[PDB]
């Protein structure tokens, strides 16, 4: 009986391949060839948020494009003030192992988590004047890799037990759980619509979920190695996933396959963080090769090298207004670039 | 600068607090602990669902010991967190090749190429009792020698040493009986050795 089911699954996969190939009339490159290239794009180190004493793992820009929160192995999640480099808060982490950060759209809550299997929600506007833990969400059997807020009330977390869940900070219970992944789910990115999201797992595949229905709506494949980053296009109809094979692809939700592949012969280190720009023309992707490349999202060719870090960059964040980009390396230095 | 002076004062205060915390925490020495299940990690933890952190102080050194064996996930995706560890403590149960494979995997990793691995052998008495009746060829078929504790232990030592490939790291093997209290002294001496080796490295002389 299991052999028949396996054969049916293989036939379904072949049907998926045939349907995906039948829709590929042309390529993105030969359509974008008629566009004027952006040319060389140069940006300088406007700011340098010194103060960290350990490796920086995340940096999420606030909804007002001024507040940036970063956590390190020192056990502190300092919420910086990007314009004047002032440090606003210093969150004391219960355990020094932190692997993710998040910032509320209203700025009230800051989320953190790591190997402790627990996603913590902090409160910034407490009446007592100090930061207090609002809720310690538990229920994951693996390390939390990336957490994002849909709003001030509900958080979605991607953990290392091949499962992404939608929490409820008010009650602290798993309202809805998404399952189906094979490997570690090491990335997550909520769409601008915020009704759906993706989670690029370690099995070289990124699955598109639905927040409300809680079912794997669509799936994508084509990567060679693990996926370490993912982020939606601003239009919400596409996303870019950064693999560990020194290449990052630009999938399309409607097409259901990779459109353009971003590879070049002089790159050997895997991606660590990939994020678009406000208009989506650029793709500021961090690298493990000591550098930080930015590519033209359409012509699929390099437009500049943002080499300014003494260690591997572990995060990348573009402000909602597009005025600056932040890269947090392992050299304990967070830099704001424009 | 209407009220931004107060903001600068708050920033300076919290920066001083972070600096003091960093200076206080820089005196501690971290030692990642690994090993098989029921391989003697617990007994040495006692002698002195997430990650388990154990801290003991000896001779004015704050030793931080992490038992990360409870992480039921891929080791590759989180092993970079312990890249800055001073030394790696390895525990092997001699009462029973999985530990050999784990040691081989952890020794040649890209993030542990310059950190020496301390190898601790537990359950020495149990192994000595078992070897008196069951030859060492049962666990390791390639062995060929007298059936006694003295040479079997040396053979196990040699085979564990043979799994390394980097010449910039050393393996400080010591044998424990799971009941002696001298383990802390051995760990402290090994840590001092590694620390002075790193200091000699920093001066461009070793």
């Amino acid at each position, epitope marked *: 009986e299991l052999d028949q089911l396996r054969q049916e699954a293989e036939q379904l996969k072949n049907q998926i391949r045939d349907a995906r190939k039948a829709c590929a009339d042309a390529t993105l490159s030969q359509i974008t060839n008629n566009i004027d290239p952006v040319g060389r794009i140069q940006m300088r180190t406007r700011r340098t948020l010194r103060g960290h004493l350990a490796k920086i793992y995340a940096m999420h820009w606030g909804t007002d494009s001024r*507040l940036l929160v970063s956590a390190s192995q020192d056990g502190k999640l300092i919420i910086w003030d990007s314009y004047t480099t002032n440090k606003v808060h210093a969150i004391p982490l219960r355990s020094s192992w932190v692997m993710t950060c998040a910032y509320a759209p209203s700025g009230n809550y800051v989320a953190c988590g790591g190997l402790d299997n627990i996603c913590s929600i902090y409160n910034l506007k407490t009446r*007592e004047g100090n930061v207090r833990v609002s809720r310690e969400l538990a229920g994951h059997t693996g390390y939390l890799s990336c957490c994002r807020f849909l709003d001030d009330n509900q958080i979605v977390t991607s953990s290392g037990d091949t499962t992404c869940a939608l929490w409820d900070i008010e009650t602290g219970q798993q309202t809805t759980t998404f399952t189906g992944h094979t490997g570690d789910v090491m990335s997550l990115s909520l769409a601008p619509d915020t009704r759906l999201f993706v989670s690029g797992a370690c099995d070289a595949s990124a699955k598109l979920w639905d927040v409300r229905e809680g079912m794997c709506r669509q799936t994508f494949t084509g990567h060679e190695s693990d996926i370490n980053a993912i982020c939606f296009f601003p239009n919400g109809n596409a996303f870019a996933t950064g693999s560990d094979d020194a290449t990052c692809r630009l999938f399309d939700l409607r097409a259901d396959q990779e459109l353009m592949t971003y590879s070049h012969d002089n790159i050997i280190c895997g991606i660590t963080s990939v994020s678009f720009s406000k208009s989506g023309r650029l793709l500021l992707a961090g690298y493990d090769d000591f550098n930080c490349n930015v590519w033209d999202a359409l012509k699929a060719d390099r437009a500049g090298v943002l080499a300014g870090h003494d260690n591997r960059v572990s995060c990348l964040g573009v402000t909602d207004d597009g005025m600056a980009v932040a890269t947090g390396s392992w050299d304990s230095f967070l830099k704001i670039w424009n | 600068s209407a009220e931004e002076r*107060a903001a600068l004062e708050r920033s300076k205060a919290i920066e001083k607090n972070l600096k003091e915390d960093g200076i206080s925490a820089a005196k501690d020495v971290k030692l990642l602990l690994l090993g098989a299940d029921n391989s003697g990690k617990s007994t040495i933890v006692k002698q002195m669902t997430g990650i388990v952190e154990t801290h003991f102080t000896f001779k004015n050194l704050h030793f931080r010991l992490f038992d990360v064996g409870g992480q039921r996930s891929e080791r590759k995706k989180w092993i970079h967190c312990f890249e800055d560890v001073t030394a790696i403590i390895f525990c092997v149960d001699l009462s029973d090749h999985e530990s050999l494979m784990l040691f081989d995997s952890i020794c040649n990793n890209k993030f542990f190429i310059d950190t020496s691995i301390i190898l601790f052998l537990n359950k020495k008495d149990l192994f000595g009792e078992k070897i008196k009746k069951s030859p060492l060829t049962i666990c390791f078929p390639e062995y060929t020698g007298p059936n006694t504790y003295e040479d079997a232990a040396a053979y196990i030592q040699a085979q564990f040493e043979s799994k390394n490939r980097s010449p910039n790291k050393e393996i400080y093997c010591h044998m424990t009986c799971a009941t002696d209290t001298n383990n802390a002294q051995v760990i402290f001496d090994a840590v001092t050795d590694i620390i002075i080796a790193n200091n000699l490295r920093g001066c461009g002389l070793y």
Partner: single-chain antibody, 231 residues
Framework: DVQLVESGGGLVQPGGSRKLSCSAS????????MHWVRQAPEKGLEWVAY????????YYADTVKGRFTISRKNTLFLQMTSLRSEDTAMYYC??????????????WGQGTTLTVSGSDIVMTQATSSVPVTPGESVSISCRSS???????????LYWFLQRPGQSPQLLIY???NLASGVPDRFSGSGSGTAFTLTISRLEAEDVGVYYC?????????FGAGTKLELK
């Protein structure tokens, strides 16, 4: 939750010395800069002094420097020397934290009464008493000599309200934002020099006196006090 209690008043002969103690409980008082505000028996609020977190900086008013001393176990102290004839007032202990997006002067102490036997920025209130009926809209405006639009763009105009028999509470800070615990009816406006706090659908519990502050530079100055009486 948060509660500020202070004591140490009473009748004092002229030329004496007294100590006023501000006891803080229910919040992280170590990271807050406690101010000090007095109120004349029949006039508006006046400033005394300010001590920051960790006693990094301390300021005094024009006629207070040298005579008084402010120091802070979760307890704040104010030393008094050579009380004059006009030093009699009701003293308020005011808490305030300063960071980007913070709410300074958010809470005020209970207040203790006490009896005895030219280049600074000044703000004036055009009106003092304006009759108003419930359900209508009331507008209170105060002007400043120096424009408050600083370099960063934030205008430092605060609006304070005290109901009769009650300590003042913050209503609108920075002339645009709304303090927590304040209903949406209150709304601020104005830019540069003119300011106006507009109230829509007035309630019977909003009667009192309105004071507008500036925070551009010490010393802090208050308005004359616009009182909105019923009918």
């Amino acid at each position: 939750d948060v509660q500020l209690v202070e004591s140490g008043g009473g009748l004092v002969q002229p030329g004496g010395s007294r100590k006023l103690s501000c006891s803080a409980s229910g919040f992280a008082f170590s990271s807050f800069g406690m101010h000090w505000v007095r109120q004349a028996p029949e006039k508006g609020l006046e400033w005394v002094a300010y001590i920051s977190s960790g006693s990094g900086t301390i300021y005094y008013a024009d006629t207070v420097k040298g005579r008084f001393t402010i120091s802070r176990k979760n307890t704040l102290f104010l030393q008094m020397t050579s009380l004059r004839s006009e030093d009699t007032a009701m003293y308020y202990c005011v808490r305030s934290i300063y960071y980007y997006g913070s709410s300074p002067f958010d809470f005020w102490g209970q207040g203790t009464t006490l009896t005895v036997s030219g280049s600074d920025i000044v703000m004036t209130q055009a009106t003092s008493s304006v009759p108003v009926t419930p359900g209508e809209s009331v507008s209170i405006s105060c002007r400043s000599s120096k424009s408050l639009l600083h370099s960063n763009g934030n205008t430092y105009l605060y609006w304070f309200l005290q109901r009769p028999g009650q300590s003042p509470q913050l209503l609108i800070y920075r002339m645009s934002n709304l303090a927590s615990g304040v209903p949406d009816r209150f709304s601020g406006s104005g830019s540069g020099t003119a300011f106006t706090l507009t109230i829509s659908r007035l309630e019977a519990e909003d009667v009192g006196v309105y004071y507008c502050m500036q925070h551009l530079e010490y010393p802090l100055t208050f308005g004359a006090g616009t009182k909105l009486e019923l009918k």
